[PDB]
Amino acid sequence: VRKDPITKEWTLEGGALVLADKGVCLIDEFDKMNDQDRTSIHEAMEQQSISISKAGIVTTLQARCSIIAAANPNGGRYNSTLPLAQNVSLTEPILSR
Amino acid sequence: DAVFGDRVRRFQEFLDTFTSYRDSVRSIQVYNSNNILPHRIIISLDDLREFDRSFWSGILVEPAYFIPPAEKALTDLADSMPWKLSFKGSFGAHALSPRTLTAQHLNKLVSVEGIVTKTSLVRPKLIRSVHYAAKTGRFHYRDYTDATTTLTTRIPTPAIYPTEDTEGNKLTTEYGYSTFIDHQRITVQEMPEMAPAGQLPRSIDVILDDDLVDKTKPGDRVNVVGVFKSLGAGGMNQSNSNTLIGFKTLILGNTVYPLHARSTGVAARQMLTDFDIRNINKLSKKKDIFDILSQSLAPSIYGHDHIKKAILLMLMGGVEKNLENGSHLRGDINILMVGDPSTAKSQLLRFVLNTASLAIATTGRGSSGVGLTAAVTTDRETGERRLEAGAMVLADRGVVCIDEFDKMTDVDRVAIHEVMEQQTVTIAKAGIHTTLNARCSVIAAANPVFGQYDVNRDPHQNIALPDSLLSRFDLLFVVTDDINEIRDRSISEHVLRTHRYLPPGYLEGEPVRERLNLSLAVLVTIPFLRKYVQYAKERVIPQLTQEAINVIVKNYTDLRNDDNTKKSPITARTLETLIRLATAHAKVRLSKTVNKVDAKVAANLLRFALL
Amino acid sequence: TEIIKSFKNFILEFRLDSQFIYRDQLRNNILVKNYSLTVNMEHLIGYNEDIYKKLSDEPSDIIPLFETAITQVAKRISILSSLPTFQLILNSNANQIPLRDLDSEHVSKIVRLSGIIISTSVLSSRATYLSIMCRNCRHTTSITITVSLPRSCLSTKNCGPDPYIIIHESSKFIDQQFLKLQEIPELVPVGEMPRNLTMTCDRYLTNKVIPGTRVTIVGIYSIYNVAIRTPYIKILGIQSDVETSSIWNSVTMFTEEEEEEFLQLSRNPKLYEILTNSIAPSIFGNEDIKKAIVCLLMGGSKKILPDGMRLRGDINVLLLGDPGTAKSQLLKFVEKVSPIAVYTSGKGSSAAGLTASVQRDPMTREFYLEGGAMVLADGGVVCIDEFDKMRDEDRVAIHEAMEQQTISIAKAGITTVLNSRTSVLAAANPIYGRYDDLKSPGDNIDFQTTILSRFDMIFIVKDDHNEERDISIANHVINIHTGNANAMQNQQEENGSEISIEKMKRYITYCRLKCAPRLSPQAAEKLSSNFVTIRKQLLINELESTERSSIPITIRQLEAIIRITESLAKLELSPIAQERHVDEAIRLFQASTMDAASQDPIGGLN
DNA sequence: CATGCATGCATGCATGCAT
DNA sequence: ATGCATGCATGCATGCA
Numbered sequence A: 001v002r003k004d005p006i007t008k009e010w011t012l013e014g015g016a017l018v019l020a021d022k023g024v025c026l027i028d029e030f031d032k033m034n035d036q037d038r039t040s041i042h043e044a045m046e047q048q049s050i051s052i053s054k055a056g057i058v059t060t061l062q063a064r065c066s067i068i069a070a071a072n073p074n075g076g077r078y079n080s081t082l083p084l085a086q087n088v089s090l091t092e093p094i095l096s097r
Numbered sequence B: 001d002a003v004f005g006d007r008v009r010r011f012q013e014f015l016d017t018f019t020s021y022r023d024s025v026r027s028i029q030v031y032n033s034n035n036i037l038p039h040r041i042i043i044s045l046d047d048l049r050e051f052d053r054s055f056w057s058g059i060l061v062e063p064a065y066f067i068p069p070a071e072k073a074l075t076d077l078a079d080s081m082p083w084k085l086s087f088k089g090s091f092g093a094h095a096l097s098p099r100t101l102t103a104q105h106l107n108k109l110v111s112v113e114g115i116v117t118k119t120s121l122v123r124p125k126l127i128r129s130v131h132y133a134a135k136t137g138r139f140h141y142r143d144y145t146d147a148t149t150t151l152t153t154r155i156p157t158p159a160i161y162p163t164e165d166t167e168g169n170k171l172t173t174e175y176g177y178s179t180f181i182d183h184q185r186i187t188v189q190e191m192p193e194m195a196p197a198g199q200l201p202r203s204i205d206v207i208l209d210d211d212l213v214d215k216t217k218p219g220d221r222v223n224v225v226g227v228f229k230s231l232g233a234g235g236m237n238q239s240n241s242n243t244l245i246g247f248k249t250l251i252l253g254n255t256v257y258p259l260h261a262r263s264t265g266v267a268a269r270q271m272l273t274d275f276d277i278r279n280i281n282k283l284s285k286k287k288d289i290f291d292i293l294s295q296s297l298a299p300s301i302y303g304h305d306h307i308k309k310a311i312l313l314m315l316m317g318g319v320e321k322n323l324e325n326g327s328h329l330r331g332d333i334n335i336l337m338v339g340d341p342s343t344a345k346s347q348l349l350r351f352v353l354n355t356a357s358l359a360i361a362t363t364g365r366g367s368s369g370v371g372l373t374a375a376v377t378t379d380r381e382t383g384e385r386r387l388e389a390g391a392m393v394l395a396d397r398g399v400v401c402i403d404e405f406d407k408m409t410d411v412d413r414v415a416i417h418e419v420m421e422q423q424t425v426t427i428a429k430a431g432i433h434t435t436l437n438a439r440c441s442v443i444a445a446a447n448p449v450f451g452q453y454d455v456n457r458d459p460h461q462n463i464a465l466p467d468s469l470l471s472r473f474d475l476l477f478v479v480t481d482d483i484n485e486i487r488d489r490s491i492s493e494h495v496l497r498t499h500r501y502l503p504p505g506y507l508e509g510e511p512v513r514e515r516l517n518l519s520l521a522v523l524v525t526i527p528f529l530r531k532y533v534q535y536a537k538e539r540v541i542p543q544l545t546q547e548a549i550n551v552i553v554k555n556y557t558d559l560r561n562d563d564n565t566k567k568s569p570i571t572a573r574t575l576e577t578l579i580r581l582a583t584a585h586a587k588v589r590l591s592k593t594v595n596k597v598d599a600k601v602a603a604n605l606l607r608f609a610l611l
Numbered sequence C: 001t002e003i004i005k006s007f008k009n010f011i012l013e014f015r016l017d018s019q020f021i022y023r024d025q026l027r028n029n030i031l032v033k034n035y036s037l038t039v040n041m042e043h044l045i046g047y048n049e050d051i052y053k054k055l056s057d058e059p060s061d062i063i064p065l066f067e068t069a070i071t072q073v074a075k076r077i078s079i080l081s082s083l084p085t086f087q088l089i090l091n092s093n094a095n096q097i098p099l100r101d102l103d104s105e106h107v108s109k110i111v112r113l114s115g116i117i118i119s120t121s122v123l124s125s126r127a128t129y130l131s132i133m134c135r136n137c138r139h140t141t142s143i144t145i146t147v148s149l150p151r152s153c154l155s156t157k158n159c160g161p162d163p164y165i166i167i168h169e170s171s172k173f174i175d176q177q178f179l180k181l182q183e184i185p186e187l188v189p190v191g192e193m194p195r196n197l198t199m200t201c202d203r204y205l206t207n208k209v210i211p212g213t214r215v216t217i218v219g220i221y222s223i224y225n226v227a228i229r230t231p232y233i234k235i236l237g238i239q240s241d242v243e244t245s246s247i248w249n250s251v252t253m254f255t256e257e258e259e260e261e262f263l264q265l266s267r268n269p270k271l272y273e274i275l276t277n278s279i280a281p282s283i284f285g286n287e288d289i290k291k292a293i294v295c296l297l298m299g300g301s302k303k304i305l306p307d308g309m310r311l312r313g314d315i316n317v318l319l320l321g322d323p324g325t326a327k328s329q330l331l332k333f334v335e336k337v338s339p340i341a342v343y344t345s346g347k348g349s350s351a352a353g354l355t356a357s358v359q360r361d362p363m364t365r366e367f368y369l370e371g372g373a374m375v376l377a378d379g380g381v382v383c384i385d386e387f388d389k390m391r392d393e394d395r396v397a398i399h400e401a402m403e404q405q406t407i408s409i410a411k412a413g414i415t416t417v418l419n420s421r422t423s424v425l426a427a428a429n430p431i432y433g434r435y436d437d438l439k440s441p442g443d444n445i446d447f448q449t450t451i452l453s454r455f456d457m458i459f460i461v462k463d464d465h466n467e468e469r470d471i472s473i474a475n476h477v478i479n480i481h482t483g484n485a486n487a488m489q490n491q492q493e494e495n496g497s498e499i500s501i502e503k504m505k506r507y508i509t510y511c512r513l514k515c516a517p518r519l520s521p522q523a524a525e526k527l528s529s530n531f532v533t534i535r536k537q538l539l540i541n542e543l544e545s546t547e548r549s550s551i552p553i554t555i556r557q558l559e560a561i562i563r564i565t566e567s568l569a570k571l572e573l574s575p576i577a578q579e580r581h582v583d584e585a586i587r588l589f590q591a592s593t594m595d596a597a598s599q600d601p602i603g604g605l606n
Numbered sequence D: 001c002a003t004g005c006a007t008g009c010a011t012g013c014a015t016g017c018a019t
Numbered sequence E: 001a002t003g004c005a006t007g008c009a010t011g012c013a014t015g016c017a
């Protein structure tokens, strides 16, 4: 819930996942996200919706979109001696969707 | 012109019938014949309803044409044998909150309850200005008035400060012979306990003057009775101002009450009658008093007889000292519990939070160590860097209940060392250097480091707290859940007995109803326990005697040189602890001398806690 | 004149659906103190189209006529069967115009819009009857309602310009409110800021929506002030489209027909089975989990004692197990079939917290509850997925919320004990990706084993690899996709064998609101004897061994069973709980928790 | 809205102790 | 010798004028 640069007006802006409903979200550098991004992507990929409770606005928004993501392995080189789950930073709950 | 006099007469004959208020006129008047009490009387609207319904409905619905006549009648009575009026009783639909106040209620007498969110700086207001003319040697005077002075509307007058006399002689002000009256403006909001979650709250301004100008502080729960008014012109006078504005509204307060809640600054209070005092004195004679007052604390919990005795002693409290030089000796009692899960710890913390006259609750990782010690270096609108009170500052002369005390980090635990023993909070940071009072007591709960108490290991391996902190806690108790057969049968029967209980005036199967408890401030039941505690704490101060001196010095010396193992170390503080406990017990008996039994009981309690 | 006559005739005789509706609506409203009338605009394309086309065009001139017509017909209604002007709410169900297509051609006309509210200001006072007086000669008069006060004295000895003052003690006012509408944030352009609009309502259409609600508006596209003006909308009616449930908007009124239906259902001799079979019929097996999810939705019976102690009456349930056992789908189902429910994870939701948060007001700089899942859902259910990962402050707060049913805040300046009376349904997954048989249950979790004593029932669902149940599950999940298990196979079962989602939601609300069972003296003995037995066989096995049991048995489980037994009697509207219910309570408790201690090397001995 | 100082909170790293 | 826990030091977020 941000402020508009020109109209001095509040705006409820959903992320790329709520803005890509009935479309596709293309995510680059998928392995270098902070806590907020991981939580948002987890909710989107679990329930295909995003909740929000900010500044008097309590609502839910639809995020029925497909996700295509790109990433790089730990250390910058894939190690075939280990399972894929140990070559990437992503945990299992996000890697099972 | 004629209705005014008729209303004056109708209020005079209302006073004539009910003679109570007549009594309360000679009262604030014979005493002002050598703090001058203020000339405000309080009337119960229920009596005014049962006397004259029309006059009652007029006050409720049309105050501006009914209150000034009553004030004039009251002033006439006082003079014969000005005075202002305050109202209490039922208000029906007029009792509202900041959320439900609408344009339907403008120009009516209302009562609104909420949280005080923003007070102002009290200032004087000019009401009469005197002048001296030396050339003629005479005194003159001018009068001033404004919208918020009277309820009725009066044509504005051209306020102008006189500088020259009619004859031309120059004037000089006589500041000491003028008249000034205090004025404050406050803001009230909807309480967090009632406002819907996730929605921005609603506010209302209130204006106070004269003797109602400073009676509440920010963050308190308040109930204001006053008239809802309208002022100015929302662009109506102007030829072209706007089409998106309205009239400004506020409340002309005439009564303010502080309300007591949980985890709130205001302290509960009851009015003690002759019957209550007589009953307390009669009850204090029985020899098992310390057990009657002790088994009645949380009677739904099984056992823990000694923690309950400690709770009562902490509630009563000892006596502090102030030496001539300026030294200060602590007089409070603090308690720590370390226990296994499901040992009724948090249920005893909540009992204290609900029965103490003033207590504030806090969890562990929840509140930081600056949120407890009041390091609120902030800034106000005036620009003065100010300290905002905290949990321990607000709990001055109260109690602080700390749950999950072991989760509190050291950087947070070390801020409490000063408060628990020095009873002050000295804050010295950029641009600010001040000291506040934190004369509180602490009751805290925690669990071992291994999840359960390992009897094989040494206590220091389980409790895992510094000796510095452990010394400040007067009594440290250890509670263990040991699986038995005889004990389990008793504790199950008791628990199942509690879960089969019906409040009076209910039908088996009918759900019970819950409500918020906002009281009006100023085995035995809980109310009698509160009354007993208030009387004992307010009107008793025992003194030490030689017998207690001997018992305490014997016990301390014996404990210091011991071959046993203790849950906590022994220092000089322990001696003071023995003196505190003794005094507390002497306070329970309503005695002015700490006798020998008090000291013996203190010794037994400490020995049970330690060994 | 003819306009007012036609409107009066319309109100007095329309008689659609073989019944006159506006007449009786006025009769009811004039009694319930609601000085307003609601009329559908399509109804006016019938009785008379001339007035409809005269209203849709130049409405600013016609509305007042209709309102005074309503006032003069309410006069007749009152007399045959002093009040103010009657307001007209104007609903519609015609074609809508996108908020981005409003342009000049729509100025000063009735328009239909749809969007989401994002803000609502405080109420404002506007004048409807002014009393004024001349400050020089004291001439008094009045005004009725841009109007302004008399420019010169009307007494006509020169009072001068602007001689009148407003006498507030005798004037009348009404309410007003402003609202902001924003276009749905899901069809915005592909990287241009969304548009928004301003709207103004008054009288009986104030305090009817809260921010975040999806709504439809019918209003007038009006304009207010190089030759550029500011458009806005004058509200004539609002219709809520998408909302969120909560404690304050709950409905406690039951129609007589609904009461009879529920009373008939309560006597079904196979109700406990129909309810179970209605819980997520699209998953295979998991009978005991569903039976516990049913007892969860009813709760127990809260008590208050004369010492002020509060006893809990809610059920908390925990589910551990391997991946792919439909334990996340169960939470999603529990969210859809409860009156109040929130679904979240351990680390909160996107831009929404997990527990109470106290932030400062955007404008007033004052303290206010931002909103947390454990306070938004008071009186409902909270479904926490991935219970094993979350912050420590969240843990410490939930521990209090789960037994004392409240959250305490002590921040600089604000100290308050809130209310959070909810039931926790938690799902977690064991560490290492599978539940090992060799390790104790306490060593398969990623948090303190002291937490497992909090919950009332713990289930350990394990995925065993078998060549029979694999084909069974494959056939079951192939059928739901093929469509033969769609709404063809569960509609046949609604004939006394299954309940719908909204029927059962109401049946849960009715039960919660009407019944509060109480054990019987025989059930007390049968509950007190099983407890003194389960705890001997733990002391025995713990004394024999050196380590302690990961799954402990505490006094919190005696009350957990008193709650399972009181919950099994509340779905039949029964006022007393009997040993017939204690037997089922014991049976459920043995399949969840004691079956979890059955797998501990220490507690599961013998 | 950028610059730079002082408070307070959070995180990640290192060291020590125990198994 | 390895792993886990605790304490400390480095970083960031706020708040400011």
Ligand SMILES: Nc1ncnc2c1ncn2[C@@H]1O[C@H](COP(=O)(O)OP(=O)(O)O)[C@@H](O)[C@H]1O
Residues within 6 Å of the ligand: B300, B301, B302, B303, B339, B340, B341, B342, B343, B344, B345, B346, B347, B348, B491, B495, C403, C555, C556
């Ligand atoms: N001695 C006891 N007598 C009665 N009830 C008890 C007793 N000990 C525990 N309980 C019950 O067990 C529950 C444990 O909750 P709580 O008091 O929070 O445990 P803890 O000791 O961890 O704080 C309470 O609801 C309480 O009613």
Ligand SMILES: Nc1ncnc2c1ncn2[C@@H]1O[C@H](COP(=O)(O)OP(=O)(O)O)[C@@H](O)[C@H]1O
Residues within 6 Å of the ligand: C282, C283, C284, C285, C322, C323, C324, C325, C326, C327, C328, C329, C473, C476, C477
């Ligand atoms: N017992 C079952 N019966 C029917 N479908 C099932 C069953 N177990 C899993 N599924 C399928 O698997 C999905 C559930 O996976 P999910 O719940 O996300 O895994 P987890 O429970 O580990 O979080 C659903 O789409 C469901 O159709």
Ligand SMILES: [Mg+2]
Residues within 6 Å of the ligand: B345, B346
């Ligand atoms: Mg506890």
Ligand SMILES: [Mg+2]
Residues within 6 Å of the ligand: C327, C328, C385
């Ligand atoms: Mg899952």
Ligand SMILES: [Zn+2]
Residues within 6 Å of the ligand: C134, C135, C136, C137, C138, C139, C153, C154, C155, C159, C163
């Ligand atoms: Zn005049």
